[PDB]
């Protein structure tokens, strides 16, 4: 009377996603804002 095979359940293994959009966008903004940190020496 053969025992059940009993394979392991892998369905709980999950890969996560990253969200750094806030940071990416902010870097572009800080770059644009360094325009009005430029000097006009007159």
């Amino acid at each position: 009377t053969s025992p059940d095979v009993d394979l392991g359940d892998i369905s709980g293994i999950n890969a996560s996603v990253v969200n750094i959009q806030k940071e990416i966008d902010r870097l572009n903004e800080v770059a644009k804002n360094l325009n009005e940190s430029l000097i006009d020496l007159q």
Binding site: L7, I13, A15, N28, V30, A31, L34, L38, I39
Partner: protein, 77 residues
Amino acid sequence: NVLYENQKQIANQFNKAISQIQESLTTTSTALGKLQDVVNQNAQALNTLVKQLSSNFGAISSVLNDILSRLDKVEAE
């Protein structure tokens, strides 16, 4: 003239350097975006893989158990 051009020295450098820094920031931002995109694509791939694998192991399990039961009976008679 001398110390009036000393204030014109500071300005040419600080301007040019801010141009380099601005470029470094957008380059960093671009690099981070490219990493986010691949990291997330590969996450998706892995999750899809787990789905399909979990399906396949269900089927394999079920079929193996059926075969074992069938073969048990055929050997017992």
